[PDB]
Amino acid sequence: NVVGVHYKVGRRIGEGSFGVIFEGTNLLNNQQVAIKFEPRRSDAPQLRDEYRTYKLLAGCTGIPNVYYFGQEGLHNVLVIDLLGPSLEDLLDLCGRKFSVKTVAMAAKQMLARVQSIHEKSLVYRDIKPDNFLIGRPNSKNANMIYVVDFGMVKFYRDPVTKQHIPYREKKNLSGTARYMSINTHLGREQSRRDDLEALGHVFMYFLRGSLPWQGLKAATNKQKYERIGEKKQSTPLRELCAGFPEEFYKYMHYARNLAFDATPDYDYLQGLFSKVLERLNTTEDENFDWNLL
Amino acid sequence: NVVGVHYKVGRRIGEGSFGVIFEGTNLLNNQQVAIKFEPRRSDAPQLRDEYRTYKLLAGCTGIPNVYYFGQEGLHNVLVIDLLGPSLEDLLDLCGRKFSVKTVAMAAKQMLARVQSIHEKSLVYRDIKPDNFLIGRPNSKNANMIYVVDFGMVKFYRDPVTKQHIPYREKKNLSGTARYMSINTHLGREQSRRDDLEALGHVFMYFLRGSLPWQGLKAATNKQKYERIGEKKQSTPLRELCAGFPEEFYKYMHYARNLAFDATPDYDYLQGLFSKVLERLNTTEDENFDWNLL
Numbered sequence: 359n360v361v362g363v364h365y366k367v368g369r370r371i372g373e374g375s376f377g378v379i380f381e382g383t384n385l386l387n388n389q390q391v392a393i394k395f396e397p398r399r400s401d402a403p404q405l406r407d408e409y410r411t412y413k414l415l416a417g418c419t420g421i422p423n424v425y426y427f428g429q430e431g432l433h434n435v436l437v438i439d440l441l442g443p444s445l446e447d448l449l450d451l452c453g454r455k456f457s458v459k460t461v462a463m464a465a466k467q468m469l470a471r472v473q474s475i476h477e478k479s480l481v482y483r484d485i486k487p488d489n490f491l492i493g494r495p496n497s498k499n500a501n502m503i504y505v506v507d508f509g510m511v512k513f514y515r516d517p518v519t520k521q522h523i524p525y526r527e528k529k530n531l532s533g534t535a536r537y538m539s540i541n542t543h544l545g546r547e548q549s550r551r552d553d554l555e556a557l558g559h560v561f562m563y564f565l566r567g568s569l570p571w572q573g574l575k576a577a578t579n580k581q582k583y584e585r586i587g588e589k590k591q592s593t594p595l596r597e598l599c600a601g602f603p604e605e606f607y608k609y610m611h612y613a614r615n616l617a618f619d620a621t622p623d624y625d626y627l628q629g630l631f632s633k634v635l636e637r638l639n640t641t642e643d644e645n646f647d648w649n650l651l
Numbered sequence: 652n653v654v655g656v657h658y659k660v661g662r663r664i665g666e667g668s669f670g671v672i673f674e675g676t677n678l679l680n681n682q683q684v685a686i687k688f689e690p691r692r693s694d695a696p697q698l699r700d701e702y703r704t705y706k707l708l709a710g711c712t713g714i715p716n717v718y719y720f721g722q723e724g725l726h727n728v729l730v731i732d733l734l735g736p737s738l739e740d741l742l743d744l745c746g747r748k749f750s751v752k753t754v755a756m757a758a759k760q761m762l763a764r765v766q767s768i769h770e771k772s773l774v775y776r777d778i779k780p781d782n783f784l785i786g787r788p789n790s791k792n793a794n795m796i797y798v799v800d801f802g803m804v805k806f807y808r809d810p811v812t813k814q815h816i817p818y819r820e821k822k823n824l825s826g827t828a829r830y831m832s833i834n835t836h837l838g839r840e841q842s843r844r845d846d847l848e849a850l851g852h853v854f855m856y857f858l859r860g861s862l863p864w865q866g867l868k869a870a871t872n873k874q875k876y877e878r879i880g881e882k883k884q885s886t887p888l889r890e891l892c893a894g895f896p897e898e899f900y901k902y903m904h905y906a907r908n909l910a911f912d913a914t915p916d917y918d919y920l921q922g923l924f925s926k927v928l929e930r931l932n933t934t935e936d937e938n939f940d941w942n943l944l
């Protein structure tokens with residue numbers, strides 16, 4: 359099947375809320391790509407926006423290159439680089455949990471990606487293990503972690519004047535409840551701190567194998583987000599992070615306490631993870647759990 | 652990491668009961684392979700047997716080539732061709748069910764693989780969607796279905812004299828309860844008919860999205876296999892296959908009724924599936940659900 363004049367559609371490799379992702383090849387150079395098909399419907403995310411965002415982030419480390427955007431009948435297509443499995447997929451292959459070393463090494467890369475996005479005056483707003491993918495097996499970047507899916511990004515400040523957006527409330531709950539920040543549950547405008555908090559939730563998820571608020575009770579959607587939000591507030595950080603390196607508690611504590619328009623101290627955060635590795639008497643290498651027997 | 656003198660171990664791609672499968676490359680020719688690591692322990696399946704079986708089936712269509720078998724410290728390794736995702740994985744990408752066309756086309760290939768194994772005087776005994784994989788994306792055999800994992804094969808007849816094995820009982824339950832034949836639950840020696848029945852269970856699983864005996868009640872292992880076995884016996888075929896082409900009921904009916912040492916009429920079975928395609932006014936092509944938007 360051929361789309362975008364010179365891209366041959368292969369088999370499905372992923373599925374989302376409204377879109378299907380296929381692996382394919384650019385017929386002019388035989389390069390492998392991923393094609394995201396999005397149905398043009400009222401309740402679907404505008405793929406052109408994701409395209410714009412990819413262009414705006416072109417060149418940043420860990421961000422895939424975008425090649426084509428266009429309409430194919432009743433769908434909008436986005437052609438980007440073909441990447442490997444997500445960290446969620448990798449979990450399934452490693453006993454549903456990652457060791458401290460893997461989490462610290464992964465955290466450093468993930469945190470760097472989020473910083474790149476923030477420096478472009480954007481907040482990601484959809485932090486989840488599913489959106490972080492590693493490179494292709496036989497590639498130089500086989501162990502590099504990338505970020506895909508920019509469907510929910512938003513500008514937290516004017517790019518030119520750096521004037522931060524005002525604090526607002528009544529916001530409608532968007533992304534993944536399991537990882538969202540407490541402020542998000544509370545219907546507050548999301549900023550840099552929220553991305554960092556959600557990232558901390560993912561880190562703890564990796565270490566423990568699960569979060570205290572996963573799979574609750576016979577409730578409805580609005581009840582789900584709420585019961586989860588309440589459980590997050592009632593769960594003490596010392597408890598959430600008990601048994602793991604102190605730096606994890608410190609990360610959670612920092613993220614949770616940042617002010618709405620505060621500029622994160624990314625260097626401090628990166629340092630926490632480097633400390634974790636030091637204590638383990640290990641370095642930041644490529645020995646992730648998924649490359650180990 | 653290098654094993655078997657010239658095979659470089661990459662990342663994990665699969666996991667089983669005792670073994671871990673990694674993707675890798677043969678350093679002499681840069682060919683991609685899959686390396687199966689098996690811990691040398693009392694309760695683990697002898698990988699040398701799987702090796703022997705691969706050799707015995709060398710050359711058969713849909714059977715991957717074996718390259719190396721050996722010990723690497725506390726593990727036994729088996730190097731075979733690198734294949735694509737399993738049909739179980741593909742299900743996840745297609746809404747947890749396959750259309751009639753995909754099932755009929757898939758059935759023809761799967762049935763051909765089982766026949767090849769039977770013709771070599773062996774019964775597979777581990778029929779499940781997880782053991783049927785398609786080829787690699789950019790390959791001529793991208794849409795060919797293969798069979799891997801020969802850990803439970805057994806000779807049902809002497810290869811030279813073709814003298815069939817006697818009927819025995821008290822057999823201990825082995826493989827996947829969800830797909831096994833009723834005779835298997837009953838602790839009876841498995842033969843060709845059982846492989847065919849389990850294959851029918853998989854076909855119905857594909858079509859319906861689930862089987863009537865999936866996820867039962869708070870029971871134990873021996874209770875699980877039993878409750879499942881009882882549910883299989885209490886579930887009428889007309890009921891199991893209701894709503895789908897008559898040929899599916901006919902396949903189930905044939906498989907269920909074969910005698911212990913009966914030689915299946917593979918041609919008759921293949922014909923049923925061809926009829927299904929004819930009625931759909933379609934042919935056996937490569938338009939599986941996973942290649943379709």
Ligand SMILES: Nc1ncnc2c1ncn2[C@@H]1O[C@H](COP(=O)(O)OP(=O)(O)OP(=O)(O)O)[C@@H](O)[C@H]1O
Pocket residue numbers: 371372373374375376377378379392394422438439440441442444488489491506507509
């Ligand atoms: N570039 C890519 N290379 C390889 N796999 C990819 C690529 N892009 C996406 N995937 C896979 O496809 C899945 C879904 O992609 P994506 O998140 O863009 O779909 P979506 O409909 O926007 O998702 P959702 O709404 O579920 O977050 C990813 O989670 C991942 O498993």
Ligand SMILES: Nc1ncnc2c1ncn2[C@@H]1O[C@H](COP(=O)(O)OP(=O)(O)OP(=O)(O)O)[C@@H](O)[C@H]1O
Pocket residue numbers: 664665666667668669670671672685687715731732733734735737781782784799800802
């Ligand atoms: N040759 C291969 N190429 C690609 N993927 C493969 C290959 N062999 C196996 N796999 C993947 O790895 C998974 C497990 O493999 P395998 O079934 O051989 O392990 P096992 O320990 O014998 O399994 P189990 O006991 O779970 O059946 C497969 O189900 C499939 O997902």
Ligand SMILES: [Mg+2]
Pocket residue numbers: 374488489507
């Ligand atoms: Mg996603």
Ligand SMILES: [Mg+2]
Pocket residue numbers: 667781782800
């Ligand atoms: Mg298996």
